[PDB]
């Protein structure tokens, strides 16, 4: 095959273009579009409001103009965002300004993509190599990253867990061990549906503190407790139900296996281990690479989790996938028993 000039152009402006996406991130981070919409319409004006180097900013601004994010400033027209540029306004529902915000977790993490070669070579995430510690430990210690990461996820919404909680019968369930339960959304929805149910959530300090508050707010502290812990170490209690809610997808096959082995060990005899997890092609592969690059994990298909569970001494007992009005993706609950 012989590449056309159009192929070359698309490679240079788009696919191989690492400059423009950083310009967008700098643009979002500086609230450039917001400052323009609030009245700034000159370079010195924007520079003054962003505390940026006037000449350097003009250069970012020329680029942003060529690529279609800003317009005007014809060297006597007024500097302004384009229709596309309006995506960076603070309140657009697509939250693109938050996604690109270098202060935010996702964009911050995206920068670790400069270590992608090593990621493809070793299968290991680049995040720690860039920032000093692994993704979740970083988010745990830094509330701005944690909250910013959470704010962009549908799981963080008010009714996020109603449907999955609705999908399983908790009536006879006595004690749920919620491994890496985050701020406790699933556990709370469960505890509310099952008044006699007790719960134990194991988490890093950051999310543990937020889960404590969620449980208190809900009148659940009497029966749902929070334990700060490392789910790579032996779990602190046993339970007739062990829950992994959107946890496995964050880990490599190897790390996910060590987590499950840990869960099987805390699972009381006869108990149930539950894994709740789960154009078009572009977005899944994007997500997949972020997951790999950020934390060493991946979205696994059903069978893949089944085989992984099988290697942890678990056998599939039942499976259910369903949709929600809240989530942009259907969810699924894999229910396992100890095969021994
Ligand atoms: C997808 S997030 C939250 C998952 C949550 N159960 C839910 O329903 O969304 C994954 C969680 O695993 C937690 N985590 C990561 N490493 C951990 C570890 N070593 N010990 C405990 N929790 C950990 C993170 O703090 C994060 O809250």
The CATH number linked to 114 is 1.10.287.1350
Which of 83, 102, 121 delimits the end of a domain? 102
Both 267 and 127 in one domain: the answer is no
As given in the structure block, the two tokens for residue 86 are 């309006």
Chain breaks in the chain (C to N over 2.5 A) after: 75, 278
Both 97 and 212 in one domain: the answer is no
DSSP class of 200: E
Mutate to test the pocket of ligand 1, among 145, 148, 182, 184 (most ligand atoms within 8 A of CB): 182
Q: What is the Rg, in whole angstroms, of the alpha carbon atoms belonging to the chain? A: 23
340 annotated as a binding-site residue: no
Note the helical H segments in the chain: 5-10, 19-29, 32-37, 43-50, 54-66, 96-100, 105-110, 116-122, 127-131, 135-141, 143-151, 162-166, 185-193, 205-217, 253-266, 280-295, 302-310
Atom 20 of ligand 1: nearest residue by CA position: 230
Experimental method: X-ray
In angstroms, rounded to a whole number, what is the distance separating the alpha carbons of residues 132 and 120? 20
Going from the C-alpha of 227 to that of each of 72, 83, 250, the distances in angstroms are 56, 48, 21
In angstroms, rounded to a whole number, what is the distance separating the alpha carbons of residues 166 and 305? 22
Both 70 and 179 in one domain: the answer is no
In angstroms, rounded to a whole number, what is the distance separating the alpha carbons of residues 64 and 79? 11
Both 123 and 194 in one domain: the answer is no
Give ∠ CA 148-51-63 in degrees, rounded to 5.
80
Both 161 and 75 in one domain: the answer is no
Contact 181 CB / ligand 1 (< 6 Å): yes
Give yes or no for a contact between 63 and 23, defined as CB atoms under 8 angstroms apart: yes
Q: Could you tell me the CATH number of the domain that includes residue 270? A: 3.40.50.150
Both 182 and 146 in one domain: the answer is no
CA nearest 220: which of 181, 254, 258, 193?
193
In angstroms, rounded to a whole number, what is the distance separating the alpha carbons of residues 125 and 252? 9
Bridge-based pairing of strands 331-338 and 314-322 is: antiparallel
Both 135 and 283 in one domain: the answer is yes
232 annotated as a binding-site residue: no
Adjacent-strand bridge partners of 58: none
Give ∠ CA 90-91-95 in degrees, rounded to 5.
80
Both 94 and 171 in one domain: the answer is no
Counted domains in the chain: 3
In angstroms, rounded to a whole number, what is the distance separating the alpha carbons of residues 293 and 295? 6
Q: End-to-end alpha-carbon separation of the chain, Å?
A: 57
Place of tokens 């609030």: 38
As given in the structure block, the two tokens for residue 147 are 């909250």
Q: Can you say whether the dihedral through the CA atoms of 170, 172, 174, 179 is positive or negative?
A: negative
Atom 26 of ligand 1: nearest residue by CA position: 182
CA nearest 170: which of 193, 202, 149?
193
Q: Could you tell me the CATH number of the domain that includes residue 15? A: 1.10.10.10
The size of the chain, in residues, is 340
Distance 137 CA to ligand 1 centre (A): 10
In angstroms, rounded to a whole number, what is the distance separating the alpha carbons of residues 15 and 177? 45
Distance 208 CA to ligand 1 centre (A): 10
In angstroms, rounded to a whole number, what is the distance separating the alpha carbons of residues 238 and 266? 4
As given in the structure block, the two tokens for residue 258 are 């060590």
180 annotated as a binding-site residue: yes
In angstroms, rounded to a whole number, what is the distance separating the alpha carbons of residues 277 and 295? 16
In angstroms, rounded to a whole number, what is the distance separating the alpha carbons of residues 211 and 224? 10
Give yes or no for a contact between 203 and 229, defined as CB atoms under 8 angstroms apart: yes
As given in the structure block, the two tokens for residue 291 are 């997951």
Both 225 and 264 in one domain: the answer is yes
Q: Can you say whether the dihedral through the CA atoms of 103, 107, 111, 115 is positive or negative?
A: positive
Contact 204 CB / ligand 1 (< 6 Å): yes
User: By residue range, what is the domain housing residue 148?
Assistant: 103-153+279-296
CA nearest 50: which of 77, 82, 26, 74?
26
Q: Can you say whether the dihedral through the CA atoms of 4, 7, 13, 19 is positive or negative?
A: negative
Give yes or no for a contact between 177 and 237, defined as CB atoms under 8 angstroms apart: yes
Both 122 and 166 in one domain: the answer is no
Contact 297 CB / ligand 1 (< 6 Å): no
What are the residues whose beta carbons fall under 8 Å from the beta carbon of 4, sequence distance 6 or more?
none
Strand, coil or helix: what is 221?
A: coil
Place of tokens 């900013």: 57
As given in the structure block, the two tokens for residue 268 are 């009381």
Place of tokens 């430990």: 137
Quote the crossing angle between the two packed helices 19-29 and 54-66, to the nearest 10°.
120
Contact 81 CB / ligand 1 (< 6 Å): no
Both 138 and 158 in one domain: the answer is no
Phi-psi region of 182 (alpha: psi -120 to 50; beta: other; left: phi over 0): left
The H or E element spanning position 319 is strand 314-322
CA nearest 329: which of 183, 86, 154, 117?
154
DSSP class of 1: -
Going from the C-alpha of 56 to that of each of 47, 53, 74, 328, 338, the distances in angstroms are 9, 5, 17, 39, 61
Both 325 and 312 in one domain: the answer is yes
Which of 71, 102, 133 delimits the end of a domain? 102
Reported resolution in A? 2.1
């Amino acid at each position: 095959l012989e590449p056309t000039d159009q192929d070359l152009d698309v490679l240079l402006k788009n696919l191989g273009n690492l400059v423009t996406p950083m310009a967008l991130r700098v643009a979002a981070t500086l609230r450039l579009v917001d400052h323009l919409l609030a009245g700034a319409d000159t370079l010195a004006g924007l520079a003054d409001r962003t505390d940026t180097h006037p000449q350097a900013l003009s250069r970012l601004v020329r680029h942003l103009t060529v690529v279609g994010v800003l317009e005007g400033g014809e060297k006597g027209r007024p500097l302004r965002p384009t229709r596309l540029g309006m995506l960076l306004a603070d309140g657009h529902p697509a939250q693109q300004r938050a996604w690109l915000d270098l202060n935010g977790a996702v964009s911050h993490a995206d920068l670790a993509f400069t270590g992608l070669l090593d990621v493809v070579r070793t299968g290991r995430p680049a995040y720690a190599g860039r920032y000093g510690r692994p993704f979740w430990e970083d988010l745990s210690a830094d509330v701005a990253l944690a909250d910013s990461f959470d704010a962009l996820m549908s799981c963080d919404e008010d009714l996020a867990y109603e449907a999955p909680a609705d999908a399983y019968d908790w009536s006879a369930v006595r004690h749920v061990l919620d491994v890496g339960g985050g701020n406790g959304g699933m556990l709370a929805a469960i505890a509310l549906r099952a008044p006699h149910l007790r719960g134990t959530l194991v988490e890093l300090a950051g999310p543990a503190e937020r889960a404590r508050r969620r449980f208190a707010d809900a009148g659940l502290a009497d029966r749902v407790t929070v334990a700060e812990g490392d789910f790579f170490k032996p779990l602190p209690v046993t339970a007739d139900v062990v829950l992994l809610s959107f946890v496995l997808l964050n880990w490599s096959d190897e790390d996910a296996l060590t987590i499950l082995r840990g869960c099987v060990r805390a699972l009381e005899p006869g108990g149930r281990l539950l894994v709740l997890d789960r154009a078009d092609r572009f977005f899944s592969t994007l997500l997949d690479l972020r997951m790999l690059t950020f934390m060493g994990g991946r979205v696994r298909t059903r069978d893949e989790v089944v085989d992984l569970a099988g290697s942890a001494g678990l056998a599939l007992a039942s499976e259910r996938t369903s949709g929600s009005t809240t989530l942009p993706f259907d969810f699924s609950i894999l229910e396992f028993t100890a095969v021994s």
